[PDB]
Every structure is written in structure tokens, then in C-alpha cells.
Amino acid sequence: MRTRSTISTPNGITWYYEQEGTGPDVVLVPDGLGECQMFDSSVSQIAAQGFRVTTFDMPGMSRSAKAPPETYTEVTAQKLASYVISVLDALDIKHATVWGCASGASTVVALLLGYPDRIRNAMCHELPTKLLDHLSNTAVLEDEEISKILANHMLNDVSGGSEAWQAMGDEVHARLHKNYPVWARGYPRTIPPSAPVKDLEALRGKPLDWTVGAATPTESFFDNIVTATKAGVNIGLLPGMHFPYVSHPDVFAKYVVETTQKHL
Amino acid sequence: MRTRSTISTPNGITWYYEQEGTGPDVVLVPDGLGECQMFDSSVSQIAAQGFRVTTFDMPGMSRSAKAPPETYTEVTAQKLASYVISVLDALDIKHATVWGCASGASTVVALLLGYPDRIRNAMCHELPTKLLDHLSNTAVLEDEEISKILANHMLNDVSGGSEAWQAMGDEVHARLHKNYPVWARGYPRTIPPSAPVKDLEALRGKPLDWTVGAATPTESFFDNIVTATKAGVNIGLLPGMHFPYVSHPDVFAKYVVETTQKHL
Ligand SMILES: C[C@H]1CCC[C@@H](O)CCC/C=C/c2cc(O)cc(O)c2C(=O)O1
Ligand SMILES: C[C@H]1CCC[C@@H](O)CCC/C=C/c2cc(O)cc(O)c2C(=O)O1
């Protein structure tokens, strides 16, 4: 049985969150699009292995749109981490395993480094350390041009699985539609330079498990593989690209449970 | 002005080879398809920066087909390295910079490790260390089914640049046509286990520059990036996939000259 609900935190944000299962806490942090329905079926798979899984739309996105501006503009890993800690403090989640892709990856590494007592282990996927002008330059467009470009780009190029992507349904795509512009203005100039992956030695020996998309062109996250390997951090692949939880839910879910079981 | 000619070596092979320019010796080893016309425009670009560039069709391939069976069956990095040292002995090339992709890559690191006095520096691109069953399984097909599958796969998927690939013209494709089956039977079962990258400390300090294709899916040569980074070996990207010398000749040529200039 899944809890769908809202909870507010004292940084002015009102989160939409979902939660299923009983057991140690596993937290699924979204990618930059901030949309926790992407996790829907995996929240169930993971929970069925004896975990309490929590997830939530991110600030300014989807149903967590009631949030002050600082929370979705000039977004950094360190800002996102403190926001996620706040929603963990409100839900009374003390010790959590965390997953995140893209800005979620940057977020979970910042969580692991900043709050080591709170984080049992962190799985980061495709952490973005580089400025990409093709993304950054969308920010100057008209809102509705941004949605068209970005929606089309997710569907045709980088979903990892276009059928799975489309099957999320009209409601999700209508929420994503509104998110694309806020993401485009808030995230890609300031997320990469916040990457908390420049201090190698802070990573060494930490409970961190890094992945990258198997179908993703080698250039996009080449740097993650170098960095993980220099730091001694476990690094491997998942199928698909940026959204293994949409394209390959079963393998995703299994990966999260297995990795969590390593650290209990 | 370019020399186009043949020379025979005492291991039974008669090589077709081309050679242009004056300067330090740069040697372009083909990928598995064995076809040195892929390097045409680059042989000129590199030479024009003051090098003597040599290239050649590989044994059993294209115009170097007059060769005994051991030279194109159960092919190995160590065999290919022996064969190229022979054609370098016959052409009186004593010190050479070498490039090679795929089986060429394996060949040039075997060359660097086995004949250190002969090799000024080696550039390896996408060195294959894994058995792939989809390639290995083509070997049991009818010759002409192998050509159709592999030619289609190069043109549609994996060329890095489909226009450039097709622009090599009818003669080269009619030679590749005959090579595909020889390659399929000779190379993919035995090249990966010969990968001379299992001794990390043999690679450390060596004059080796490793690249991978930028557009190539991350899974294919994930392992190269790990292995390079563990060995302290310089590792970067080129544009396209397995054939940067076809898809991106200008940036390929510049990369070979620039890297060679680092080691004079
Ligand atoms: C929302 C996803 C979209 C992936 C598109 C994908 O094709 C582009 C992948 C590289 C960029 C990801 C990204 C980079 C940033 O600087 C900040 C981010 O929040 C993201 C990120 O979350 O990317
Ligand atoms: C000729 C290219 C095939 C390109 C398809 C290419 O997309 C196939 C994936 C990479 C494999 C390359 C390869 C693997 C081997 O075990 C032996 C080889 O000689 C090659 C090789 O040279 O690869």
C-alpha cells in the first residue's frame, strides 16, 4: 500500500512524496526533471524486498512546485542535498540508502560527504561535471519552445527506451512539460561546477556505488569512469541511458536492492 | 607524392603498402577489416607536417591477401605485432610511431611492450578485451551472409559517419566485402583474450596514448578507460566511433601529428 501525500519543511518547500514498504530506508532522488512517478514500479519492487522506499518530486517541479525561488534557481548539489535532508528530517528518516541520477547523483554524493551519519550508502548515476552549451543555451528561449525541444529530445534521443518513456502517460508528460523550462533555467549552468567529485580523496573508502548508462555515448560520462577509478570507487554499467528506472525498471530495482544489501 | 607498391616478408606474406612524406616514421595500422585506403587523406595530412607515413592492408585482407592461413586465422595481438615488425624490417623502418584501432590497438600495444626499441610511441583506440557473442556467432554463417550483415552494420550503425563511410567508394567496399568473412572467422574469438593489457605495471610510464570513440556506446570500451586510468596511461576521446580516420579525418590527422610531436 502506497502513501501519496505532502509534507512541508521549514525552508518553505511543500513536497509531494510517496512511500511504500517496511524495512531499512531507501530513498529515490529524481533526476533534474524532478518527477517521482518515474520510479513508480520500482518503488514497489524494492519495497517488496523488505525496504521502506520514499521518493518525492523535487522543488519547483511537478507536485513539489510550492517552493521559494532559491530552491529551483542557481541550483547546486549542496542546495539539493540540504533540501533532501530537510524532507528526511520531516519524515523521520534517520539512516537512508540513496539513489540519484544526473543532478540526483550530484545530490547523493553531496549527501554522503556532508551527512555521513545519515547515509548508509549512495548510488550515483551519470553525475554531470561539465557545462554543456546545448543545454545551457535553451534557458534563453521562450518557455514553450523549451518544453518542445526538451520533450522531443527525451522521447527521440536519450530516454534509453522510447516506448517505456511514452508509456509513463499523459499526466506525467503534462507535468514534465511544465518542468522543462524551470529545469533549463535552474540547473545546467550551476549544477556541473558544484560537482562534489573534485576531491578524490573524500570519495576514497566511502560507501558509494557509481554507475553510468550502457547505451549513453562514451563522451557524456567518460569523466565519471576516470574519477571513480582514481578514487577506488566501485563503478559499473546499467542498461539504457539517463533513466534506467524508466527503461529497465526490473534491472534497476534489482540493482538498488542488491547494492543496499551489500551495506546492511 | 605517394608510393603504392608491394613487399614480401619471409613469413609468407606479401603486403600491399603505401608511403608518403619525409621525416620520423609514422605507421598507421588498420582495424580488423585490414584496409589501408581508410587512411588515405590522413596519410597526406600527417606527412605534410613532416612525417614519413606508412600504411598497409593487413594479412589475408584486401591487397595483402597473399599470405599463409595462420596469419589470418586464430589471429592474436602477438601474431599481428610479429607481422608488422616484419614489414617494418623489410621497409627499413627502425623507429616508428604507431596508431591502431581495435585489433590494431591490441597490435600496437603488443608492439610497444614487445619491441620497445622499435616503438617511439603508440596510439591505441578502442582495444577489445571482451568476447562478444554477436560477432563470434557470425563466423558460422555463409561467407556472403557475413558480408551483408557486417557491411550493413558498418554503414548503418557503427561507422561514426555514414556519409564519409559511403564516400570511400565502390572499390574499397568491394575489398571490404571479401574481408568481412575472413575477419569474422579469424579475429573475434582470439583477439580479445590476447589483449596485452592484463599487466597494468607493464603499461605504466610507457609512451602510450589511449583513445576511445566519443559516440560509441559507453559499454563497448568502458573497460579501456578503467584500465588506462589504473595504469596512469593518458586516455581521451576522439569523435565518431571505430573509424575516426574515416568519419573525422581532419581531427584524426591533427591528433596523430600532435601526439607524435609530444614524443620527438
Ligand atoms: C534532466 C537530465 C536530462 C538528461 C538529458 C541528457 O541527454 C543530457 C545529459 C547531460 C546533462 C544532464 C544534466 C546536466 C546538468 O548540468 C544538470 C542536470 O540536472 C542534468 C540532468 O538532470 O539531466
Ligand atoms: C573491425 C571492427 C568491427 C567494427 C564493428 C564493431 O562495432 C564491433 C564492436 C567492437 C569490436 C571490435 C573488434 C573486436 C574483436 O574481438 C576483434 C576485432 O578485430 C575488432 C575490430 O577490429 O572491430
Q: What share of chain A is helix, strand, coil (3-state, %, to 5)?
A: 50, 20, 30
CB spacing of B225 vs A221 below 8 angstroms: no
Residue nearest to atom 15 of ligand 1 (CA): A188
Whole-number Å distance between alpha carbons of B262 and B252? 15
Domain encompassing residue A199: 1-264
Whole-number Å distance between alpha carbons of A238 and A216? 10
Whole-number Å distance between alpha carbons of B104 and B102? 5
Strands, E assignment, chain A: 3-9, 13-20, 25-29, 52-56, 96-101, 119-125, 208-213, 234-238
Can you tell me which residue has the cell 523549451?
A146
Can you tell me which residue has the cell 558509494?
A208
CB A251 within 8 A of CB B236: no
Residue among A237, A256, A218 at smallest CA distance from A42: A256
CB B226 within 8 A of CB A225: yes
Whole-number Å distance between alpha carbons of B37 and B31? 12
CB A70 within 8 A of CB A11: no
- Sequence-separated (6 or more) residues with CB below 8 Å from residue B43: B2, B18, B20, B21, B28, B53, B55
SS3 labels along B154-187: HHHHHCCCHHHHHHCCHHHHHHHHHHHHHHHHHC
Can you tell me which residue has the cell 551519519?
A117
User: Sheet holding A3-9: strands in order across?
Assistant: A3-9, A13-20, A52-56, A25-29, A96-101, A119-125, A208-213, A234-238
Task: Tell me the resolution in Å.
Answer: 2.5
CB spacing of A225 vs B221 below 8 angstroms: no
Query: Nearest by CB to B218, which of A229, A230, A237?
Result: A237
Report the domain count for chain B. 1
CA distances, B176 to each of A111, B126, B166, B184 (Å): 53, 20, 12, 12
CB A241 within 8 A of CB A165: no
Name B52's bridge partners. B25
Q: What share of chain B is helix, strand, coil (3-state, %, to 5)?
A: 50, 20, 30
Q: Quick one: DSSP state of residue A154? A: I
Written as nine digits, the cell of A18 is 510517496
Whole-number Å distance between alpha carbons of B190 and A57? 50
Greatest C-alpha distance within chain B:
48
- Sequence-separated (6 or more) residues with CB below 8 Å from residue A204: A231, A232, A233
Distance in Å, alpha carbon of A243 to nearest chain B alpha carbon: 15
B240 touches chain A (CB under 8 A): no
Q: Quick one: DSSP state of residue A196? A: T
DSSP SS3 for B139:
helix
Positive or negative, the Cα torsion across A86, A90, A96, A99?
Answer: negative
Let me know the angle formed at the C-alpha of B110 by B106 and B113, rounded to the nearest 5 degrees.
Answer: 140
Residue type at A241 in one-letter notation: M
Whole-number Å distance between alpha carbons of B5 and B190? 30
Q: Obtained via which technique?
A: X-ray
CB spacing of A216 vs B217 below 8 angstroms: yes
CB B85 within 8 A of CB B118: yes
Rg (CA), chain A: 17
DSSP secondary structure of B76-115: -HHHHHHHHHHHHHHTT--SEEEEEETHHHHHHHHHHHH-
Can you tell me which residue has the cell 574499397?
B172
